[PDB]
Design a binder for these strands. Structure first.
Ligand SMILES: Nc1ncnc2c1ncn2[C@H]1C[C@H](O)[C@@H](COP(=O)(O)NP(=O)(O)OP(=O)(O)O)O1
Ligand SMILES: [Mg+2]
Ligand SMILES: [Mg+2]
Length: 430
DNA sequence: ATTATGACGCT
DNA sequence: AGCGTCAT
Protein backbone atom coordinates (compact mmCIF):
# COMPACT_ATOMS: atom_id res chain seq x y z
CA UNK A 1 0.00 0.00 0.00
CA UNK A 2 1.38 3.37 1.14
CA UNK A 3 4.89 2.01 1.80
CA UNK A 4 5.51 -0.06 -1.36
CA UNK A 5 8.02 1.68 -3.63
CA UNK A 6 7.02 1.81 -7.28
CA UNK A 7 10.34 2.69 -8.94
CA UNK A 8 8.94 5.93 -10.36
CA UNK A 9 11.60 8.28 -8.95
CA UNK A 10 13.62 8.95 -12.13
CA UNK A 11 13.09 9.68 -15.81
CA UNK A 12 15.63 7.66 -17.81
CA UNK A 13 16.06 7.34 -21.57
CA UNK A 14 18.07 5.05 -23.79
CA UNK A 15 19.11 6.45 -27.17
CA UNK A 16 20.24 3.98 -29.87
CA UNK A 17 21.65 5.14 -33.20
CA UNK A 18 19.84 3.22 -35.93
CA UNK A 19 22.23 0.84 -37.77
CA UNK A 20 24.98 3.25 -36.85
CA UNK A 21 27.94 2.18 -39.00
CA UNK A 22 25.62 2.09 -42.02
CA UNK A 23 24.39 5.64 -41.34
CA UNK A 24 28.00 6.88 -41.05
CA UNK A 25 28.82 5.38 -44.46
CA UNK A 26 25.55 6.73 -45.94
CA UNK A 27 26.28 10.25 -44.75
CA UNK A 28 29.68 10.01 -46.40
CA UNK A 29 28.42 8.42 -49.66
CA UNK A 30 24.97 9.71 -50.73
CA UNK A 31 24.66 6.89 -53.29
CA UNK A 32 24.09 4.53 -50.34
CA UNK A 33 21.22 6.53 -48.80
CA UNK A 34 17.71 5.00 -48.71
CA UNK A 35 18.99 1.75 -50.21
CA UNK A 36 19.55 -1.77 -48.89
CA UNK A 37 23.06 -1.31 -47.52
CA UNK A 38 25.41 -3.11 -45.14
CA UNK A 39 28.82 -2.52 -43.59
CA UNK A 40 31.33 -5.35 -44.02
CA UNK A 41 34.79 -5.96 -42.58
CA UNK A 42 37.39 -7.79 -44.66
CA UNK A 43 36.54 -9.14 -48.12
CA UNK A 44 38.45 -12.26 -49.07
CA UNK A 45 36.68 -14.89 -46.95
CA UNK A 46 33.12 -15.24 -48.28
CA UNK A 47 32.89 -11.56 -49.22
CA UNK A 48 33.59 -10.33 -45.69
CA UNK A 49 31.58 -10.29 -42.47
CA UNK A 50 28.53 -8.03 -42.27
CA UNK A 51 28.45 -6.02 -39.04
CA UNK A 52 25.64 -3.48 -39.66
CA UNK A 53 22.52 -3.56 -41.84
CA UNK A 54 20.19 -0.84 -43.08
CA UNK A 55 16.52 -1.39 -42.39
CA UNK A 56 15.83 -1.66 -46.13
CA UNK A 57 18.32 -4.54 -46.26
CA UNK A 58 16.94 -6.12 -43.07
CA UNK A 59 13.62 -6.44 -44.91
CA UNK A 60 15.36 -8.96 -47.20
CA UNK A 61 16.64 -10.99 -44.24
CA UNK A 62 20.18 -9.59 -44.16
CA UNK A 63 21.56 -9.70 -40.63
CA UNK A 64 24.70 -8.99 -38.69
CA UNK A 65 27.14 -11.92 -38.42
CA UNK A 66 26.29 -13.02 -41.96
CA UNK A 67 28.80 -13.46 -44.78
CA UNK A 68 28.41 -10.86 -47.51
CA UNK A 69 28.28 -13.57 -50.18
CA UNK A 70 25.27 -15.07 -48.39
CA UNK A 71 23.55 -11.72 -47.86
CA UNK A 72 23.87 -11.13 -51.60
CA UNK A 73 21.92 -14.36 -52.04
CA UNK A 74 19.06 -12.86 -50.05
CA UNK A 75 19.43 -9.36 -51.49
CA UNK A 76 21.18 -9.26 -54.87
CA UNK A 77 21.14 -5.44 -55.10
CA UNK A 78 22.65 -5.11 -51.61
CA UNK A 79 25.17 -2.25 -51.44
CA UNK A 80 28.26 -2.64 -49.27
CA UNK A 81 30.61 -0.26 -47.50
CA UNK A 82 33.87 -1.65 -46.14
CA UNK A 83 35.44 -0.85 -42.79
CA UNK A 84 38.82 0.85 -43.18
CA UNK A 85 41.78 -1.53 -42.89
CA UNK A 86 44.99 -0.25 -41.29
CA UNK A 87 48.11 -2.27 -40.44
CA UNK A 88 46.30 -5.41 -41.55
CA UNK A 89 43.25 -5.05 -39.30
CA UNK A 90 39.88 -3.34 -39.16
CA UNK A 91 40.15 0.27 -38.00
CA UNK A 92 36.97 1.70 -36.45
CA UNK A 93 38.17 5.32 -36.04
CA UNK A 94 35.53 6.81 -38.36
CA UNK A 95 32.72 5.36 -36.25
CA UNK A 96 34.32 6.33 -32.93
CA UNK A 97 34.59 9.94 -34.12
CA UNK A 98 30.99 9.93 -35.41
CA UNK A 99 29.90 8.57 -32.02
CA UNK A 100 31.67 11.44 -30.27
CA UNK A 101 29.69 13.86 -32.49
CA UNK A 102 26.44 12.37 -31.26
CA UNK A 103 27.38 11.96 -27.59
CA UNK A 104 28.56 15.58 -27.40
CA UNK A 105 25.17 16.75 -28.68
CA UNK A 106 23.38 14.51 -26.17
CA UNK A 107 25.46 15.86 -23.31
CA UNK A 108 24.05 19.37 -23.93
CA UNK A 109 20.64 18.14 -22.77
CA UNK A 110 21.43 15.91 -19.79
CA UNK A 111 23.96 13.61 -18.17
CA UNK A 112 24.77 10.62 -20.40
CA UNK A 113 26.29 7.19 -19.74
CA UNK A 114 28.07 5.90 -22.84
CA UNK A 115 26.83 2.32 -23.00
CA UNK A 116 28.28 1.45 -26.40
CA UNK A 117 29.65 3.21 -29.48
CA UNK A 118 26.03 3.61 -30.65
CA UNK A 119 24.14 3.70 -27.36
CA UNK A 120 23.78 6.04 -24.39
CA UNK A 121 21.56 6.27 -21.34
CA UNK A 122 20.23 9.71 -20.40
CA UNK A 123 19.27 10.77 -16.89
CA UNK A 124 16.44 13.25 -17.52
CA UNK A 125 15.03 13.71 -13.99
CA UNK A 126 16.49 17.18 -13.45
CA UNK A 127 15.75 18.34 -16.99
CA UNK A 128 12.09 17.26 -16.66
CA UNK A 129 11.83 19.10 -13.35
CA UNK A 130 13.14 22.29 -14.96
CA UNK A 131 10.91 21.97 -18.03
CA UNK A 132 7.86 21.33 -15.84
CA UNK A 133 8.63 24.56 -14.01
CA UNK A 134 8.88 26.33 -17.37
CA UNK A 135 5.39 24.99 -18.25
CA UNK A 136 3.36 24.85 -15.02
CA UNK A 137 -0.22 24.20 -16.09
CA UNK A 138 0.29 24.27 -19.86
CA UNK A 139 -1.01 21.00 -21.35
CA UNK A 140 1.31 19.09 -23.67
CA UNK A 141 0.33 19.14 -27.34
CA UNK A 142 0.58 15.98 -29.42
CA UNK A 143 2.66 18.20 -31.75
CA UNK A 144 5.55 18.10 -29.29
CA UNK A 145 5.63 14.28 -29.60
CA UNK A 146 5.54 13.67 -33.37
CA UNK A 147 7.50 10.38 -33.27
CA UNK A 148 6.48 9.01 -29.83
CA UNK A 149 4.65 5.72 -29.18
CA UNK A 150 2.87 5.10 -25.88
CA UNK A 151 3.35 1.39 -25.21
CA UNK A 152 0.05 -0.36 -24.52
CA UNK A 153 -2.15 2.24 -26.26
CA UNK A 154 -4.49 2.62 -27.98
CA UNK A 155 -6.74 0.29 -26.00
CA UNK A 156 -10.48 -0.25 -26.38
CA UNK A 157 -12.85 1.72 -28.67
CA UNK A 158 -11.47 3.26 -39.62
CA UNK A 159 -8.07 4.95 -39.96
CA UNK A 160 -6.97 2.34 -37.37
CA UNK A 161 -5.47 0.38 -40.30
CA UNK A 162 -2.21 2.35 -40.73
CA UNK A 163 0.65 2.48 -38.25
CA UNK A 164 0.78 6.27 -37.93
CA UNK A 165 -2.94 6.40 -37.20
CA UNK A 166 -2.48 3.79 -34.48
CA UNK A 167 0.42 5.83 -33.10
CA UNK A 168 -1.58 9.06 -32.94
CA UNK A 169 -4.66 7.37 -31.44
CA UNK A 170 -2.54 5.90 -28.65
CA UNK A 171 -0.83 9.24 -28.06
CA UNK A 172 -4.22 10.99 -27.95
CA UNK A 173 -5.59 8.54 -25.36
CA UNK A 174 -2.47 9.06 -23.23
CA UNK A 175 -2.53 12.86 -23.41
CA UNK A 176 -6.27 13.05 -22.81
CA UNK A 177 -5.81 11.03 -19.64
CA UNK A 178 -2.89 13.14 -18.35
CA UNK A 179 -3.19 15.39 -15.28
CA UNK A 180 -1.03 18.41 -16.15
CA UNK A 181 -1.64 20.17 -12.81
CA UNK A 182 0.28 17.64 -10.69
CA UNK A 183 4.03 18.26 -10.86
CA UNK A 184 4.80 15.04 -8.94
CA UNK A 185 2.96 12.84 -11.47
CA UNK A 186 5.27 10.06 -12.77
CA UNK A 187 3.29 9.76 -16.02
CA UNK A 188 3.51 13.51 -16.61
CA UNK A 189 7.23 13.39 -15.85
CA UNK A 190 7.76 10.60 -18.40
CA UNK A 191 5.77 12.62 -20.94
CA UNK A 192 7.99 15.67 -20.49
CA UNK A 193 11.02 13.39 -20.70
CA UNK A 194 9.70 12.23 -24.06
CA UNK A 195 9.28 15.84 -25.19
CA UNK A 196 12.93 16.52 -24.32
CA UNK A 197 14.03 13.34 -26.11
CA UNK A 198 12.16 14.43 -29.25
CA UNK A 199 14.14 17.67 -29.02
CA UNK A 200 17.42 15.79 -28.45
CA UNK A 201 16.81 13.48 -31.41
CA UNK A 202 15.91 16.47 -33.59
CA UNK A 203 19.16 18.19 -32.64
CA UNK A 204 21.20 15.04 -33.31
CA UNK A 205 19.65 14.66 -36.76
CA UNK A 206 19.96 18.37 -37.61
CA UNK A 207 23.58 18.60 -36.52
CA UNK A 208 24.88 15.19 -37.70
CA UNK A 209 22.37 13.78 -40.15
CA UNK A 210 22.02 10.66 -37.99
CA UNK A 211 18.68 9.20 -36.88
CA UNK A 212 18.10 7.28 -33.68
CA UNK A 213 15.43 5.47 -31.72
CA UNK A 214 14.86 5.96 -28.01
CA UNK A 215 13.06 4.52 -25.01
CA UNK A 216 11.77 6.66 -22.15
CA UNK A 217 10.82 5.09 -18.82
CA UNK A 218 11.74 5.17 -15.12
CA UNK A 219 14.96 3.10 -15.22
CA UNK A 220 17.62 1.83 -17.60
CA UNK A 221 16.25 -1.68 -18.21
CA UNK A 222 12.77 -0.40 -19.08
CA UNK A 223 14.21 2.42 -21.21
CA UNK A 224 16.36 -0.08 -23.14
CA UNK A 225 13.39 -2.42 -23.61
CA UNK A 226 11.20 0.50 -24.73
CA UNK A 227 13.76 1.68 -27.28
CA UNK A 228 13.53 -1.58 -29.22
CA UNK A 229 9.72 -1.60 -29.44
CA UNK A 230 9.41 0.90 -32.33
CA UNK A 231 12.40 1.19 -34.65
CA UNK A 232 13.79 2.88 -36.64
CA UNK A 233 13.64 6.65 -36.09
CA UNK A 234 10.91 6.49 -33.41
CA UNK A 235 10.77 6.63 -29.63
CA UNK A 236 8.65 4.72 -27.11
CA UNK A 237 7.38 5.69 -23.66
CA UNK A 238 6.94 2.76 -21.23
CA UNK A 239 5.01 3.85 -18.17
CA UNK A 240 4.97 2.07 -14.83
CA UNK A 241 1.32 1.17 -15.44
CA UNK A 242 2.14 -0.47 -18.78
CA UNK A 243 4.47 -3.00 -17.16
CA UNK A 244 2.04 -5.81 -16.14
CA UNK A 245 0.62 -6.22 -19.65
CA UNK A 246 3.97 -5.65 -21.38
CA UNK A 247 5.72 -8.22 -19.18
CA UNK A 248 2.87 -10.74 -19.38
CA UNK A 249 3.98 -12.00 -22.82
CA UNK A 250 7.60 -10.79 -22.78
CA UNK A 251 10.18 -13.58 -23.11
CA UNK A 252 12.66 -13.40 -20.25
CA UNK A 253 15.58 -13.25 -22.69
CA UNK A 254 14.46 -9.81 -23.96
CA UNK A 255 15.33 -8.06 -20.67
CA UNK A 256 18.88 -6.74 -20.56
CA UNK A 257 21.28 -9.14 -18.73
CA UNK A 258 18.87 -12.10 -19.07
CA UNK A 259 19.69 -12.95 -22.69
CA UNK A 260 22.38 -15.43 -21.64
CA UNK A 261 22.94 -18.31 -19.23
CA UNK A 262 21.23 -16.64 -16.26
CA UNK A 263 18.01 -16.05 -18.20
CA UNK A 264 18.19 -19.65 -19.40
CA UNK A 265 18.55 -20.90 -15.83
CA UNK A 266 15.62 -18.72 -14.71
CA UNK A 267 13.47 -20.32 -17.43
CA UNK A 268 14.65 -23.86 -16.66
CA UNK A 269 14.67 -23.80 -12.85
CA UNK A 270 11.41 -21.93 -12.44
CA UNK A 271 9.63 -23.49 -15.44
CA UNK A 272 8.38 -20.14 -16.80
CA UNK A 273 8.63 -18.22 -20.08
CA UNK A 274 7.64 -14.60 -19.52
CA UNK A 275 9.03 -11.81 -17.36
CA UNK A 276 5.72 -11.23 -15.59
CA UNK A 277 5.56 -14.81 -14.33
CA UNK A 278 8.42 -13.91 -11.99
CA UNK A 279 6.05 -11.97 -9.73
CA UNK A 280 4.70 -15.18 -8.22
CA UNK A 281 7.97 -16.00 -6.42
CA UNK A 282 9.11 -14.50 -3.15
CA UNK A 283 12.32 -12.51 -2.98
CA UNK A 284 13.81 -15.28 -0.82
CA UNK A 285 12.93 -17.97 -3.40
CA UNK A 286 14.62 -16.03 -6.20
CA UNK A 287 17.66 -15.39 -4.03
CA UNK A 288 17.86 -19.10 -3.19
CA UNK A 289 17.99 -20.01 -6.86
CA UNK A 290 20.06 -17.16 -8.32
CA UNK A 291 21.96 -15.54 -5.43
CA UNK A 292 21.23 -12.53 -3.23
CA UNK A 293 22.07 -9.88 -5.81
CA UNK A 294 20.40 -11.56 -8.79
CA UNK A 295 17.36 -12.58 -6.75
CA UNK A 296 16.72 -9.09 -5.37
CA UNK A 297 17.24 -7.64 -8.85
CA UNK A 298 14.76 -10.11 -10.39
CA UNK A 299 12.18 -9.56 -7.66
CA UNK A 300 12.21 -5.82 -8.27
CA UNK A 301 12.69 -5.98 -12.05
CA UNK A 302 9.68 -8.16 -12.83
CA UNK A 303 7.63 -5.42 -11.10
CA UNK A 304 9.23 -2.77 -13.33
CA UNK A 305 11.63 -1.55 -10.62
CA UNK A 306 15.39 -1.15 -11.06
CA UNK A 307 17.83 1.18 -9.37
CA UNK A 308 21.05 1.03 -11.42
CA UNK A 309 22.08 4.69 -11.81
CA UNK A 310 22.91 6.42 -15.06
CA UNK A 311 26.66 6.74 -14.50
CA UNK A 312 28.06 10.12 -15.54
CA UNK A 313 30.57 8.80 -18.07
CA UNK A 314 30.86 10.18 -21.62
CA UNK A 315 34.17 8.53 -22.47
CA UNK A 316 35.03 4.83 -22.78
CA UNK A 317 36.76 3.29 -19.73
CA UNK A 318 39.18 1.27 -21.87
CA UNK A 319 40.92 1.60 -25.22
CA UNK A 320 41.51 -1.74 -26.90
CA UNK A 321 42.65 -3.29 -30.18
CA UNK A 322 42.16 -6.93 -31.08
CA UNK A 323 42.28 -9.28 -34.02
CA UNK A 324 41.09 -12.84 -34.50
CA UNK A 325 43.20 -15.26 -36.55
CA UNK A 326 40.69 -17.98 -37.42
CA UNK A 327 41.15 -21.31 -39.14
CA UNK A 328 44.34 -21.66 -41.15
CA UNK A 329 45.33 -18.04 -40.44
CA UNK A 330 46.16 -18.87 -36.80
CA UNK A 331 49.60 -17.64 -35.74
CA UNK A 332 52.16 -20.44 -35.61
CA UNK A 333 55.59 -18.74 -35.55
CA UNK A 334 57.33 -16.40 -33.11
CA UNK A 335 57.92 -13.74 -35.79
CA UNK A 336 54.21 -13.80 -36.65
CA UNK A 337 53.05 -13.28 -33.06
CA UNK A 338 55.53 -10.44 -32.61
CA UNK A 339 54.64 -8.68 -35.87
CA UNK A 340 50.93 -8.68 -35.07
CA UNK A 341 51.53 -7.52 -31.51
CA UNK A 342 53.43 -4.65 -33.11
CA UNK A 343 50.55 -3.79 -35.47
CA UNK A 344 48.04 -3.83 -32.60
CA UNK A 345 50.41 -1.79 -30.42
CA UNK A 346 50.88 0.83 -33.15
CA UNK A 347 47.15 1.35 -33.52
CA UNK A 348 46.89 1.43 -29.72
CA UNK A 349 49.61 4.08 -29.42
CA UNK A 350 47.93 6.25 -32.06
CA UNK A 351 44.58 6.03 -30.27
CA UNK A 352 46.10 6.52 -26.80
CA UNK A 353 48.03 9.62 -27.84
CA UNK A 354 44.90 11.11 -29.39
CA UNK A 355 42.96 10.21 -26.22
CA UNK A 356 45.53 11.86 -23.94
CA UNK A 357 45.40 15.05 -26.01
CA UNK A 358 41.59 15.14 -26.21
CA UNK A 359 40.63 14.02 -22.71
CA UNK A 360 43.47 14.86 -20.27
CA UNK A 361 44.08 11.33 -19.06
CA UNK A 362 46.68 8.57 -19.35
CA UNK A 363 46.23 4.82 -19.23
CA UNK A 364 48.42 3.02 -16.70
CA UNK A 365 47.77 -0.70 -17.25
CA UNK A 366 48.17 -2.84 -20.37
CA UNK A 367 46.03 -5.99 -20.51
CA UNK A 368 47.19 -8.66 -22.97
CA UNK A 369 44.64 -11.32 -23.90
CA UNK A 370 45.07 -14.30 -26.23
CA UNK A 371 43.03 -17.25 -27.46
CA UNK A 372 44.66 -20.59 -28.28
CA UNK A 373 43.51 -22.83 -31.11
CA UNK A 374 40.82 -25.25 -29.95
CA UNK A 375 39.71 -23.15 -26.96
CA UNK A 376 36.13 -21.95 -27.42
CA UNK A 377 36.34 -19.37 -24.63
CA UNK A 378 36.73 -15.81 -25.89
CA UNK A 379 40.00 -15.48 -23.96
CA UNK A 380 42.34 -18.35 -23.21
CA UNK A 381 44.64 -16.16 -21.15
CA UNK A 382 44.85 -12.63 -19.75
CA UNK A 383 47.96 -11.04 -18.23
CA UNK A 384 48.67 -7.45 -17.25
CA UNK A 385 51.76 -5.29 -17.19
CA UNK A 386 52.47 -1.67 -16.40
CA UNK A 387 51.75 0.80 -19.19
CA UNK A 388 54.35 3.50 -18.49
CA UNK A 389 55.00 4.99 -21.95
CA UNK A 390 52.86 5.46 -25.07
CA UNK A 391 55.38 3.63 -27.25
CA UNK A 392 54.29 0.87 -29.61
CA UNK A 393 57.56 -1.09 -29.62
CA UNK A 394 57.74 -1.08 -25.83
CA UNK A 395 54.09 -2.09 -25.52
CA UNK A 396 54.42 -4.95 -28.04
CA UNK A 397 57.63 -6.17 -26.41
CA UNK A 398 56.01 -6.08 -22.96
CA UNK A 399 52.96 -7.98 -24.21
CA UNK A 400 55.23 -10.64 -25.71
CA UNK A 401 57.22 -10.91 -22.48
CA UNK A 402 53.99 -11.42 -20.59
CA UNK A 403 52.47 -14.08 -22.91
CA UNK A 404 55.55 -15.94 -24.17
CA UNK A 405 55.43 -18.76 -21.59
CA UNK A 406 52.17 -20.02 -23.12
CA UNK A 407 54.17 -21.33 -26.09
CA UNK A 408 54.94 -25.04 -25.71
CA UNK A 409 58.02 -25.19 -27.96
CA UNK A 410 59.72 -23.72 -31.02
CA UNK A 411 60.95 -19.92 -33.48
CA UNK A 412 57.72 -21.92 -33.70
CA UNK A 413 54.59 -21.12 -31.69
CA UNK A 414 52.30 -23.89 -30.49
CA UNK A 415 49.47 -24.18 -29.91
CA UNK A 416 48.62 -21.64 -32.63
CA UNK A 417 47.08 -18.34 -31.52
CA UNK A 418 43.60 -17.51 -32.79
CA UNK A 419 43.28 -14.08 -31.13
CA UNK A 420 45.47 -11.22 -29.88
CA UNK A 421 44.04 -8.38 -27.78
CA UNK A 422 45.75 -5.35 -26.23
CA UNK A 423 43.67 -3.20 -23.88
CA UNK A 424 44.78 0.01 -22.15
CA UNK A 425 42.96 0.42 -18.82
CA UNK A 426 43.12 2.21 -15.45
CA UNK A 427 43.16 5.81 -16.62
CA UNK A 428 44.23 8.67 -14.37
CA UNK A 429 44.01 12.42 -14.86
CA UNK A 430 46.86 14.12 -16.69
C1' DA B 1 35.74 -18.42 -40.10
C1' DT B 2 29.04 -15.18 -35.78
C1' DT B 3 34.53 -9.12 -35.65
C1' DA B 4 36.10 -5.88 -32.76
C1' DT B 5 35.16 -4.19 -29.38
C1' DG B 6 32.98 -2.51 -24.92
C1' DA B 7 30.97 -2.96 -19.72
C1' DC B 8 31.00 -5.59 -15.51
C1' DG B 9 30.81 -9.68 -11.88
C1' DC B 10 33.09 -13.44 -9.08
C1' DT B 11 36.75 -15.17 -6.39
C1' DA C 1 45.00 -10.71 -10.31
C1' DG C 2 42.79 -13.69 -13.64
C1' DC C 3 38.66 -15.86 -15.35
C1' DG C 4 33.55 -15.73 -16.60
C1' DT C 5 29.26 -13.16 -18.46
C1' DC C 6 26.58 -10.13 -21.37
C1' DA C 7 26.14 -7.13 -25.21
C1' DT C 8 25.96 -5.52 -31.00
N1 LIG D 1 28.86 -7.48 -32.88
C1 LIG D 1 29.17 -6.36 -33.50
N2 LIG D 1 30.11 -6.32 -34.48
C2 LIG D 1 30.36 -5.15 -35.07
N3 LIG D 1 29.79 -3.97 -34.88
C3 LIG D 1 28.85 -4.05 -33.93
C4 LIG D 1 28.50 -5.17 -33.21
N4 LIG D 1 27.51 -4.94 -32.31
C5 LIG D 1 27.29 -3.61 -32.46
N5 LIG D 1 28.05 -3.05 -33.43
C6 LIG D 1 27.96 -1.67 -33.88
C7 LIG D 1 28.01 -1.52 -35.39
C8 LIG D 1 26.57 -1.29 -35.85
O1 LIG D 1 26.40 -0.01 -36.44
C9 LIG D 1 25.75 -1.40 -34.58
C10 LIG D 1 25.01 -2.71 -34.45
O2 LIG D 1 24.54 -2.88 -33.09
P1 LIG D 1 23.06 -2.48 -32.64
O3 LIG D 1 23.13 -1.18 -31.99
O4 LIG D 1 22.63 -3.58 -31.62
N6 LIG D 1 22.12 -2.45 -33.96
P2 LIG D 1 22.08 -1.29 -35.10
O5 LIG D 1 22.75 -0.06 -34.70
O6 LIG D 1 22.67 -1.86 -36.42
O7 LIG D 1 20.56 -0.92 -35.37
P3 LIG D 1 19.35 -0.81 -34.34
O8 LIG D 1 19.94 -0.95 -32.96
O9 LIG D 1 18.74 0.54 -34.58
O10 LIG D 1 18.42 -1.94 -34.67
O11 LIG D 1 26.67 -1.21 -33.49
MG1 LIG E 1 21.77 0.89 -33.10
MG1 LIG F 1 23.16 -0.05 -30.08
Amino acid sequence: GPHMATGQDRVVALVDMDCFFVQVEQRQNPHLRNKPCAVVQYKSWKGGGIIAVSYEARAFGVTRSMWADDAKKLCPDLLLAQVRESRGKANLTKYREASVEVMEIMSRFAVIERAAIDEAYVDLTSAVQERLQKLQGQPISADLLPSTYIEGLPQGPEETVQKEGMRKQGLFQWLDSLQIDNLTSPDLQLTVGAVIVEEMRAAIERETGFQCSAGISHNKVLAKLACGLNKPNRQTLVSHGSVPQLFSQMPIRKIRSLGGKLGASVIEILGIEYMGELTQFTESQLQSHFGEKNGSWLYAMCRGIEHDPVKPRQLPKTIGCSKNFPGKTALATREQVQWWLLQLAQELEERLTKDRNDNDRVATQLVVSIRVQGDKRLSSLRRCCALTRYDAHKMSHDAFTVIKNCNTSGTEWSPPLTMLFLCATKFSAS
